[PDB]
Amino acid sequence: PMSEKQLADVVERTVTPLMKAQAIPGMAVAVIYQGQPHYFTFGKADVAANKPVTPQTLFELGSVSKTFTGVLGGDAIARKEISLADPVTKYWPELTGKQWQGIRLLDLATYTAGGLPLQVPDNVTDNASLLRFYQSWQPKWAPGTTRLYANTSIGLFGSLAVKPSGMRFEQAMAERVFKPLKLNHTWINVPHAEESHYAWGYREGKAVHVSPGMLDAEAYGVKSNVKDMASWVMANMAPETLPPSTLQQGIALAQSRYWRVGAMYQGLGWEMLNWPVDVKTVVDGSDNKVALVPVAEVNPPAPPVKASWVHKTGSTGGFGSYVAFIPEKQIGIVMLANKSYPNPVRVETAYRILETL
Numbered sequence: 309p310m311s312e313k314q315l316a317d318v319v320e321r322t323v324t325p326l327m328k329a330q331a332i333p334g335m336a337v338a339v340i341y342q343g344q345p346h347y348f349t350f351g352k353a354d355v356a357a358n359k360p361v362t363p364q365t366l367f368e369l370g371s372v373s374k375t376f377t378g379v380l381g382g383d384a385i386a387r388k389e390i391s392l393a394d395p396v397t398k399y400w401p402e403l404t405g406k407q408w409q410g411i412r413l414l415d416l417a418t419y420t421a422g423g424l425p426l427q428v429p430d431n432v433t434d435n436a437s438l439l440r441f442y443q444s445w446q447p448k449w450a451p452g453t454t455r456l457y458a459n460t461s462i463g464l465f466g467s468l469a470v471k472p473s474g475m476r477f478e479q480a481m482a483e484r485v486f487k488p489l490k491l492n493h494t495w496i497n498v499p500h501a502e503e504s505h506y507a508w509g510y511r512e513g514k515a516v517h518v519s520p521g522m523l524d525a526e527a528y529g530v531k532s533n534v535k536d537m538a539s540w541v542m543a544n545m546a547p548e549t550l551p552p553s554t555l556q557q558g559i560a561l562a563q564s565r566y567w568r569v570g571a572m573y574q575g576l577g578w579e580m581l582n583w584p585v586d587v588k589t590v591v592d593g594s595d596n597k598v599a600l601v602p603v604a605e606v607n608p609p610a611p612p613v614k615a616s617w618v619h620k621t622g623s624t625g626g627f628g629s630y631v632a633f634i635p636e637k638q639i640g641i642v643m644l645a646n647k648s649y650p651n652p653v654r655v656e657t658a659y660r661i662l663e664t665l
């Protein structure tokens with residue numbers, strides 16, 4: 309096995325020229341290895357204030373937020389509050405258009421509703437406008453037959469999934485996921501008292517934070533530090549070490565396989581490829597195309613496979629995050645950056661580091 313000094317050398321030798329070439333001001337990395345987290349921090353959380361990245365620095369996770377949404381949805385299924393087979397109209401009866409009749413919660417959760425678009429329009433700012441948005445939408449394909457990665461899809465899934473609980477999405481997430489896992493520095497809204505930890509993101513050299521939008525918490529709005537994200541990876545990689553609960557059950561539901569596109573399998577938030585897999589296949593299987601693609605159905609959903617590469621990418625205007633783990637090998641990695649850089653490069657960097665273990 310690799311010593312702490314040897315592992316630190318591996319991470320530094322890769323991250324340092326990456327940050328220079330990409331102009332990434334700061335990065336926090338966690339490697340999960342031999343049951344332990346290993347933290348490495350580089351550069352600046354706030355360039356203008358000359359503030360370094362630390363293990364307490366908060367980064368915007370962007371679409372990595374969807375892994376929390378998927379597990380919270382799985383927890384709601386285990387609580388028998390929702391079923392993925394249920395019609396969307398069971399939870400939003402005001403959605404009366406004929407195009408919605410055959411669409412299920414499963415389709416929202418896994419991007420198979422038939423072409424829901426990538427973003428909620430910025431001018432949709434209240435519930436009446438959100439209703440008009442989904443009422444107006446015209447599908448391109450029958451549900452359960454195509455994939456189009458979309459915040460409007462899993463974002464609405466997250467919002468409807470917590471409806472039977474009576475809680476706001478943020479409340480449900482804190483009470484049912486964050487608190488039981490002791491993710492005490494993971495936030496949908498960064499409290500005033502925690503702002504000193506909040507890194508700035510950088511786009512074209514300008515400091516930026518993610519803008520508020522409808523369904524943001526569900527799709528791209530979580531902020532966290534490298535220690536909480538290591539704990540998140542550890543909980544999803546080794547949920548059998550948790551006490552029995554609906555949350556443990558929900559973690560399994562989120563890593564179940566619902567659809568296949570090429571070599572990638574769609575979970576709830578999480579995406580998976582069968583292990584062993586070459587790095588080029590992981591890169592090819594983690595491009596969310598602008599265009600729709602057909603899917604192959606996994607019916608019934610397949611339970612979690614320990615021999616999987618499990619991962620999720622995420623970005624905001626100013627941040628780029630990545631998490632990946634292999635349960636069969638009990639290794640995993642978190643990479644948090646305050647500049648967005650290409651997803652294939654995140655995969656390549658992570659894959660190379662995990663290979664050394």
Ligand SMILES: *C(=O)N1C[C@H](NOS(=O)(=O)O)CC[C@H]1C(N)=O
Nearest residue numbers: 370371372528596621622623624
């Ligand atoms: C998630 O971060 N987002 C939604 C979509 N994600 O595709 S990705 O995971 O391959 O990065 C596009 C970018 C981002 C967003 N702008 O909402």
